Amino acid sequence: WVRYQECDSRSNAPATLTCENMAGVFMLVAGGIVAGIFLIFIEIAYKSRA
Amino acid sequence: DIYFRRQVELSTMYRHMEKHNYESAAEAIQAVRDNKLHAFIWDSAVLEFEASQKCDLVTTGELFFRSGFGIGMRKDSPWKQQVSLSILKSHENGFMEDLDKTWVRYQECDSRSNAPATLTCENMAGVFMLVAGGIVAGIFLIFIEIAYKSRA
Amino acid sequence: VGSLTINEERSEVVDFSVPFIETGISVMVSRSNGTVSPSAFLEPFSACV
Amino acid sequence: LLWGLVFNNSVPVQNPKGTTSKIMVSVWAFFAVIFLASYTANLAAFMIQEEYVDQVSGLSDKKFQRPNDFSPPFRFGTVPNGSTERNIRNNYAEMHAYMGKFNQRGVDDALLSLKTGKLDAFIYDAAVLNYMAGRDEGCKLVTIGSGKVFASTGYGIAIQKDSGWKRQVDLAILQLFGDGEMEELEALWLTGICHNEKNEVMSSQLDIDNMAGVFYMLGAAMALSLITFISEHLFYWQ
Amino acid sequence: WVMMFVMLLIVSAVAVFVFEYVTIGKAIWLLWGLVFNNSVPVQNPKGTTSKIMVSVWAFFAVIFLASYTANLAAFMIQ
Amino acid sequence: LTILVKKEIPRSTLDSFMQPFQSTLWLLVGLSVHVVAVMLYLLDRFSTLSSAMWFSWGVLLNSGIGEGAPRSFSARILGMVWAGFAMIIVASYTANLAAFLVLDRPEERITGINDPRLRNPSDKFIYATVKQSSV
Amino acid sequence: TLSSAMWFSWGVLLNSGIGEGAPRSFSARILGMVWAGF
């Protein structure tokens, strides 16, 4: 009846995960993969010109 | 001994105090560093100086019996109105702050806050000895290798 | 009785009792943000290492 | 070669010739991996135990002198009727002559002026300040040093001049000091919450601009690169 | 650990695109050595246009391992 | 008997996705990259020219891009302390990232009936029990 | 590519770049992935 359930004993241990989202650090490669082809197109237009 | 003998709740402590007492301050101060006496009770205005020069001992915080050292006079001497004034004047125009700056807090080793985050990377011998042995043994292994190169 | 300090300018007219609570003139500083040391920890690795 | 791997860098570097040369670099790599993993460890030990240092100390500082060279300069607060004015007017005249524009109308108004950036420092009695340090809703920074007071005095009980009732109370107060009843009277008196009982400090490093020392270790080399360039005029005479 | 693979495999298109204007098995062998802090002898891809995405991946690597050493050092003293 | 209170929020450092100090995680270091590439260029010209930034970024980010070392030693002595500076800033970033996740939070809560938050009353704290009870 | 495997592997461990070649088979490469991870 009494001690059958818990969540977590609140010993205040911040040393745990919740690395659930990773968006702001992955967004640099998510923007790099899109902008890189445009910079490659500008570079090959330079290669074609001179 | 008056403060302890006066209190009744501390009487057993006072009964534990009768078999180890000393006669002067320096005897017990030398006897603490000789590990014959694990603790000592005295004024703060001596122990904070002693913890800044003989640099092996420490105090431990709180206070019990808050008072101050005073000038002892005979009863109803006529100087009792003069010396009670001039002391206050010396507390006003900054004389005592010069006095204890000259005499009391002039030396300070390190406020034993127990911070192990410091150096003493003085010796580095056991980690440098691998390259000190490598530089000597490497020429011998090179000699064995070139004797192998010469043979086959 | 109450909050009343001791000085020289009042002791001429009034007599006083034994000092009662230790006090003085202090200064309260602002509640500033935390600061690390103004240098990287370049203390004495340079002596030996 | 021997700098690139000790400071963890993949500089494009030709390895030395022969398999017999390959041994000592493999010792140096084991010195490198031990080295940087030591120094990151010690630095991470160092930067979570160091204490904030008390940027103003004592009334003899240049900050508490004539505030000449300071973007907006120091503003000292005090209550202009009482004992502290009569003590501060006999040692530093120009100090209170500058402080006369910064009067306050109350203790809590001094705290409200300290929280809104209106006042840099406040000067009052020691006991009331040591109480009000402990009863703020936060427990941020409070007092200079720990308990360093300038003009140490006491409180007391004023009395009629040379009456006979002085010498009795003079005994009885000492009897209270003789009985430990002031620490029994501590339960109403000055106890509180956060009397520097952590000595912790956590800081976002917007103040990481103290790296100018290693920038000084940068630009000094930017000097030396010119200096050696000048001593690269010596084959013109050789 | 599952986002790492799916964000790792996406550079094959640009690795093809730089040879059109080294990707069969020489791409992930490059892309593992620098994310786990290793000087494996690895040929860089051809052309200056390929040099950008590896310079993004290096900035993902230095942030990554410095995160994981930090969190582990937080974890093993609490 | 015991006292019941409400737990707080406190956050994690997830919102610092490579931005713990992006105020002072400066682009000034990128200008330092560019001017030290210009400085190595000037040291190499008047004693491998346009590639100096492709050297220097590869010094910083631990990425071994195909490049040659500078021929003059005057550029090499600058490169020594440039790599030393790169090691210093990455180690300091590691320690300050560990500092956010090792240090706990203030607001120590009330402890028993001997707390001046509870013993000496105020308006900022409200206390209650069930009426007509043993309390 | 046969006798040099330890001169590969120590160079995987100690972060020391030694003039060597990657293994040609992928079956050795998948082991090398988790070796560097370890």
Swiss-Prot record, chain A:
Tissue specificity statement from the Swiss-Prot or TrEMBL entry: Detected throughout the brain, in brain cortex, cerebellum, thalamus and olfactory bulb.
Localization per Swiss-Prot or TrEMBL: Cell membrane; Postsynaptic cell membrane; Synaptic cell membrane; Postsynaptic density membrane
Modification after translation, per record: NMDA is probably regulated by C-terminal phosphorylation of an isoform of NR1 by PKC. Its phosphorylated state is influenced by the formation of the NMDAR-PPP2CB complex and the NMDAR channel activity.
Transmembrane segments: 22-42
Purpose of the protein: Component of N-methyl-D-aspartate (NMDA) receptors (NMDARs) that function as heterotetrameric, ligand-gated cation channels with high calcium permeability and voltage-dependent block by Mg(2+). NMDARs participate in synaptic plasticity for learning and memory formation by contributing to the long-term potentiation (LTP). Channel activation requires binding of the neurotransmitter L-glutamate to the GluN2 subunit, glycine or D-serine binding to the GluN1 subunit, plus membrane depolarization to eliminate channel inhibition by Mg(2+).
Family as reported in the entry's similarity comment: Belongs to the glutamate-gated ion channel (TC 1.A.10.1) family. NR1/GRIN1 subfamily.
Domain notes: A hydrophobic region that gives rise to the prediction of a transmembrane span does not cross the membrane, but is part of a discontinuously helical region that dips into the membrane and is probably part of the pore and of the selectivity filter. The extracellular N-terminal domain (ATD) is a site of allosteric regulation to modulate overall receptor function.
Binding partners and assembly: Heterotetramer; the NMDAR subunits are modular and harbor tiered domains that function in concert to regulate opening and closing of the cation-selective ion channel pore. Forms heterotetrameric channels composed of two GluN1/zeta subunits (GRIN1), and two identical GluN2/epsilon subunits (GRIN2A, GRIN2B, GRIN2C or GRIN2D) or GluN3 subunits (GRIN3A or GRIN3B) (in vitro). Can also form heterotetrameric channels that contain at least two GluN1 subunits and at least two different GluN2 subunits (or a combination of one GluN2 and one GluN3 subunits) (in vitro).
Protein name: Glutamate receptor ionotropic, NMDA 1
Organism in which the protein naturally occurs: Rattus norvegicus (Rat)
Full protein: residues contained: 792 to 838 of 938
UniProtKB/Swiss-Prot annotation, chain D:
Chain segments carrying region Pore-forming: 1-16
Tissue expression: Expressed in the hippocampus including the dentate gyrus (at protein level). Detected in adult olfactory bulb, brain cortex, hippocampus, striatum, thalamus, superior colliculus, with much lower levels in inferior colliculus, midbrain and cerebellum.
Record-annotated membrane-spanning stretches: 24-39, 211-230
Chain positions recorded as L-glutamate binding sites: S83, T84, D125
Positions bearing the site annotation: Functional determinant of NMDA receptors: N8
Disulfide pairings: C139-C194
Glycosylation sites: N81
Coiled coil: none
Residues in the Cytoplasmic compartment per record: 17-23
PTM comment, free text: Phosphorylated on tyrosine residues.
Intramembrane positions: 1-16
Subcellular locations according to the entry: Cell membrane; Postsynaptic cell membrane; Late endosome; Lysosome
Extracellular-side segments: 40-210
Family affiliation: Belongs to the glutamate-gated ion channel (TC 1.A.10.1) family. NR2B/GRIN2B subfamily.
Subunit structure: Heterotetramer. Forms heterotetrameric channels composed of two GluN1/zeta subunits (GRIN1), and two identical GluN2/epsilon subunits (GRIN2A, GRIN2B, GRIN2C or GRIN2D) or GluN3 subunits (GRIN3A or GRIN3B) (in vitro). Can also form heterotetrameric channels that contain at least two GluN1 subunits and at least two different GluN2 subunits (or a combination of one GluN2 and one GluN3 subunits) (in vitro). In vivo, the subunit composition may depend on the expression levels of the different subunits. Found in a complex with GRIN1, GRIN3A and PPP2CB. Found in a complex with GRIN1 and GRIN3B.
Domain notes: The extracellular N-terminal domain (ATD/NTD) endows NMDARs with a unique capacity for allosteric modulation, harboring several binding sites for small molecule ligands that act as subunit-specific allosteric modulators of ion channel activity.
Function recorded in the entry: Component of N-methyl-D-aspartate (NMDA) receptors (NMDARs) that function as heterotetrameric, ligand-gated cation channels with high calcium permeability and voltage-dependent block by Mg(2+). Participates in synaptic plasticity for learning and memory formation by contributing to the long-term depression (LTD) of hippocampus membrane currents. Channel activation requires binding of the neurotransmitter L-glutamate to the GluN2 subunit, glycine or D-serine binding to the GluN1 subunit, plus membrane depolarization to eliminate channel inhibition by Mg(2+).
Name of the protein: Glutamate receptor ionotropic, NMDA 2B
Full-length numbering of the shown residues: 608 to 845 of 1482
